[PDB]
Design a protein that fits this description.
monomer; about 450 residues; alpha+beta; Penicillin-binding protein 2a (Domain 2); Beta-Lactamase; Beta-lactamase; 3 domains; five-stranded antiparallel beta sheet; four-stranded mixed beta sheet; 16 helices; about 20% strand; biosynthetic protein
Length: about 450
């Protein structure tokens, strides 16, 4: 009759039964579901497969975050499991619900709206893969940012994996390269050096400097071609190592160090993503003049592609460096003033000349727009030393150049076929991703289509 009152037997077993919380859902900025849980316990589903593989990561068999945003957001995503005490029989039938202070309802996890746009993510995914496959590269990465808010609109690496089946996935497939890997920025750092020299009035628009190759003691500093003299525009346009290192040489070692530091080089971003690289910025007290010089053209210091993309917000957001967001923002976060509005505006105008006839990155030109960009290729560093065959090409820029809306950054790792230069290998995916992104965002061309 009253089973609850009786001694336990083989046919009446007191059981504490889990009432599992529903894990938070992850969405794109427009409402599209990217991660959700379904009963089986609960099971995690990524409807879009490998598209947001690195950003979102995965959970373990117990519904705990293991990698990506699943790991770093674990606290608000999980919720709180509930429980109830029941009397069951040997088949598992609930015979009685038992009075207990242990009976608790579950609290579902909190839902997250990412700042990322699946339209832009798709476009970045497809073009990245096309470039990697064509150039027979080992790997690649793309970051797309909102140039005014610092919101991440897209972030993909290849090779990737299906987060619905993370068990077969390699270490190399699982690595979120945009956030975990530091690279030499090479030519990509140059606009910052030029911007600094302009900002502090160490140079101006119409100074012509001697850009002949020279020596810092024994070690030579040269360009690809001899340019007797160039103005600041020429230095930008031709990506002159000589002009850049000379401009940098007008500041002390400490002052250049503080600057690279304020740009985010050599510390963790604290973006909220797990496994962030700290990068590399050697203590200024150890710099010789040659080292200051090679740093000025992007050797001897390192940062992730995500850090590089972020530094570009100082150029696009009128001299104010923005923190990045993976979460949808109502409004631009407060940033840190790096250059005057006046300087950034001038420097954006200068960078347009790298993508026009005469510049070093004409392949990143987008029909109907002025694009400011830099591009280059460095030899790959494998444990503080160089390999033989192996290069890393990068292309980064923004549009519309006068009033920027989008930053796109692409890196291609170990291209093997059909070129080595960043301007070609990372330039076409840049071009397609940029143009597609401007179109998705409803941004009007500023000049007629050729």
């Amino acid at each position: 009759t009253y089973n609850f009152l009786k001694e336990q037997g083989d046919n009446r077993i007191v059981r504490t039964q889990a009432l599992p919380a529903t894990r938070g859902t992850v969405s794109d900025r427009n409402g599209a579901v990217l991660a959700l849980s379904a009963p089986t316990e609960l099971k995690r589903h990524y409807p879009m497969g490998n598209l947001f593989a690195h950003v979102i990561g995965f959970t373990d068999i117990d519904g705990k975050g293991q990698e990506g945003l699943e790991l770093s957001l674990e606290d608000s995503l999980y919720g709180e499991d509930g429980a109830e005490v029941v009397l069951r029989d040997r088949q598992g039938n609930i015979v009685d619900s038992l009075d207990s202070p242990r009976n608790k309802a579950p609290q579902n996890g909190k839902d997250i709206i990412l700042s990322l746009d699946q339209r832009i993510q798709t476009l970045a995914y497809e073009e990245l893969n096309k470039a990697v496959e064509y150039h027979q590269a080992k790997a690649g990465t793309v970051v797309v940012l909102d140039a005014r808010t610092g919101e991440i609109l897209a972030l993909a690496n290849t090779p990737a994996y299906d987060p619905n089946r993370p068990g077969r996935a390699d270490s190399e497939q699982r690595r979120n390269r945009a956030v975990t890997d530091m690279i030499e920025p090479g030519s990509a750092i140059k606009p910052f050096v030029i911007a600094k020299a302009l900002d502090a009035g160490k140079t101006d628009l119409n100074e012509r400097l001697n850009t002949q190759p020279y020596k810092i003691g024994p070690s030579p500093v040269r360009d690809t071609h001899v340019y007797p003299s160039l103005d600041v525009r020429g230095i930008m346009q031709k990506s002159s190592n000589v002009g850049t290192s000379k401009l940098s040489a007008r500041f002390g070692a400490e002052e250049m160090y503080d600057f690279y530091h304020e740009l985010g080089i050599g510390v963790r971003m604290h973006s909220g993503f797990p496994g962030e690289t700290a990068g590399l910025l050697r203590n200024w007290r150890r710099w010789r003049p040659i080292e200051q010089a090679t740093m000025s053209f992007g050797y001897g210091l390192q940062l992730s592609l995500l850090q590089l993309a972020r530094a570009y917000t100082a150029l696009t957001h009128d001299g104010v460096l923005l923190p990045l967001s993976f979460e949808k923002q109502a409004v631009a976060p407060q940033g840190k003033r790096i250059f005057k509005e006046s300087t950034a505006r001038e420097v954006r105008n200068l960078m347009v000349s790298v993508t026009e006839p005469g510049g070093t990155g004409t392949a990143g030109a987008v029909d109907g727009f002025d694009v400011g960009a830099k591009t280059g290729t460095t030899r790959k560093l494998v444990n503080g030393r160089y390999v033989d065959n192996k290069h890393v090409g990068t292309f980064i820029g923004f549009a519309p150049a006068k009033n920027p809306r989008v930053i796109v950054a692409v890196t291609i790792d170990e291209p093997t076929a059909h070129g080595y230069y960043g301007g070609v290998v990372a330039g076409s995916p840049f071009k397609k991703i940029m143009g597609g992104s401007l179109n998705i965002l409803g941004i009007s061309p500023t000049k007629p289509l050729t």
